[PDB]
């Protein structure tokens, strides 16, 4: 191939939440960030199905096989990373399709996973499910990422609106999830971070309960990454969230020190 230069180093301060909630048996949510031999970053969160069997195996054997592969790269450039993101989702998905089938105590499990490539002036999303990616400063909270659920569905053909949505009885219905198929098509985005302040992962237990406005009025505010996430936990929870509450928070950097 035609030659370029090397990715330039690049990470974000980012830190990782969750809580189980007062409503769960366990935390069935998973995730962590994740450096490569080169120190490329990768954000993983995944939720791991509550109406199936076993979700916290599926949603920790997603996060565990994305953390081996990743900090065993060297590194990734970034016209590759759509590619190595699906190629790497796809042969864990296949995975754990057959560890689920040929598991009686699991069989059915499945998980959400999204997850993050961070690179210097945009990051990689790949996106399995109805788990998020934003980006948010002081003027917007821009959704990244497109549900994979049922109720979205409707939305996005002008079934019901956004509002009807947030409430709606079937909300819980999954569309694409981990495990549950053989084979498995993510979405990719890519996403310049140029004028925003901070990239957001989160499972539904956030956003099921705290809507884009109370999360950017929060995240606006002056503050540490330690205190919006102590903060936007917190909220989800007095907004009486009733699942595993899991989010990351990377800032990114505007001037430099
Ligand atoms: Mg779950
Ligand atoms: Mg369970
Ligand atoms: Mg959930």
Same mark, same amino acid.
């Given at each position: 191939? =035609?030659?370029?230069?090397? #990715? ?10 969750? @809580?189980?909630?007062?409503?769960? +048996?366990?935390? $069935? ?13 990768? &954000?993983?969160?995944? @939720? ?36 190595? *993101?699906? %190629? ?13 089938? $040929? ?16 690179? $210097?002036?945009?990051? /990689?999303?790949?996106? /399995? ?8 400063? =002081? ?9 994979? =659920?049922?109720?979205?569905? &409707? ?7 956004? $509002? ?7 909300? %819980? ?12 098509? #993510? ?6 971070? %140029?004028?925003? +302040?901070? *990239?957001?992962?989160? =499972?539904?237990?956030?956003? +099921? ?8 009025? &929060? ?10 996430? @102590? ?5 989800? &929870? @007095? %907004?009486?969230?009733?699942?595993? /509450? ?10 430099? /020190?």
């Amino acid at each position: 191939h =035609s030659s370029g230069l090397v #990715p330039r180093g690049s990470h974000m301060e980012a830190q990782f939440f969750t @809580d189980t909630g007062q409503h769960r +048996d366990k935390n $069935e949510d998973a995730g962590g960030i994740f450096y490569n031999q080169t120190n490329q970053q990768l &954000l993983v969160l995944c @939720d791991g199905m509550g109406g199936h069997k076993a979700g916290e195996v599926a949603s920790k054997f997603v996060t565990d096989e994305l953390k081996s592969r990743f900090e065993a790269e060297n590194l990734i450039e970034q016209h590759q990373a759509e590619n190595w *993101l699906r %190629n790497n989702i796809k042969d864990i998905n296949f995975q754990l399709y057959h560890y689920a089938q $040929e598991n009686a105590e699991y069989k059915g499990m499945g998980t959400t996973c999204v997850c993050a490539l961070v690179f $210097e002036k945009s990051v /990689v999303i790949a996106n /399995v499910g109805d788990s998020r990616a934003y980006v948010i400063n =002081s003027r917007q909270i821009e959704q990244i990422t497109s549900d994979h =659920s049922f109720v979205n569905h &409707l939305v996005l053909t002008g079934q019901i609106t956004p $509002e009807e949505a947030f409430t709606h009885p079937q909300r %819980n219905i999954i569309t694409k999830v981990m495990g549950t198929d053989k084979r498995v098509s #993510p979405d990719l985005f890519i996403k310049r971070l %140029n004028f925003y +302040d901070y *990239l957001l992962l989160n =499972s539904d237990g956030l956003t +099921d309960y705290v809507k884009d406005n109370e999360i950017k009025r &929060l995240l606006v505010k002056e503050g540490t990454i330690e205190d919006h996430g @102590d903060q936007l936990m917190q909220l989800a &929870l @007095d %907004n009486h969230s009733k699942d595993n /509450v899991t989010f990351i928070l990377a800032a990114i950097e505007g001037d430099k /020190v």
